[PDB]
Structure formats: structure tokens, C-alpha cells
Amino acid sequence: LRHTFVVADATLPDCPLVYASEGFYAMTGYGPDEVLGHNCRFLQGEGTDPKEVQKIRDAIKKGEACSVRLLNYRKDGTPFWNLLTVTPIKTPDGRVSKFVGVQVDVTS
């Protein structure tokens, strides 16, 4: 099934995206110049459920995995439903270094 993939740097305080797959840029309409070095939340908009945004904010603080269903918006403003799974990548000393994300457009 079609999916996209990003990597966030958890050594920086606000988890900026440091790598994105070609499908991520193609699905959202943003280019690497507007994606790299930024937190993923720019994809959110009016109808994004803050209860689910909270679930990811908390899971990132606690360094746990998480899977939420988020209303996101393309660059041209049109919406799409984003099934998002965030996975923590730890160093051998237990510290979280990166977060990785699989995003599926589940608008069907």
C-alpha cells in the first residue's frame, strides 16, 4: 500500500524533519526547501483534532511510539486524512535520537 516516510531529529528540541521520501513531497505538495528543518505540524490546519495532536505531543515527550489519525492539508490547502505512526529510535544508552514516521493517505 502507498505510504510516505520521514525522519525527525530528536536531538534538537522541536523534532525538525531531516529526511523525507519522494512520496512525502509529492503527497503534500511541499518541497524540501519548505520541509527540512521544520516540525511536521505545518501540515495541520483548521479541522485537525487537537485531542489527537495531543496524543503525539505526549508520546514524543515520553519517547514512546504512537499512531493517530490526523486531518492534514496539502500546500494548496486541500485536505487529506493522514494515518500517522511515529516510532522512537534510541541510542544504546536509552536516549531517543530520532523519530521516524510512516504517513498513509487514508482518504480512500
Ligand X SMILES: *[C@@]12=NC3=[C]C([C])=C([C])[C]=C3N([C][C]([O])[C]([O])[C]([O])[C]OP([O])([O])=O)C1=NC(=O)[N]C2=O
Q: Does 100 bind ligand X (CB under 6 A)?
A: yes
- Min dist. Cβ of residue 68 to ligand X (A): 9
Q: Does 40 bind ligand X (CB under 6 A)?
A: yes
95 belongs to an annotated ligand binding site: no
Strand 4-9 vs strand 79-90: parallel, antiparallel, or unpaired?
unpaired
Q: Does 39 bind ligand X (CB under 6 A)?
A: yes
Q: What is the DSSP string of 21-85?
A: -HHHHHHH---GGGTTTS-GGGG--TT--HHHHHHHHHHHHHT--EEEEEEEE-TTS-EEEEEEE
Strand 66-73 vs strand 79-90: parallel, antiparallel, or unpaired?
antiparallel
- Min dist. Cβ of residue 103 to ligand X (A): 4
39 belongs to an annotated ligand binding site: yes
Q: Which of 53, 83, 96, 104 touches ligand X by CB under 6 A?
A: 53
Contact positions vs ligand X (CB under 6 A): 6, 8, 15, 39-41, 43-44, 53, 56-57, 60, 70, 72, 82, 84, 86, 99-101, 103
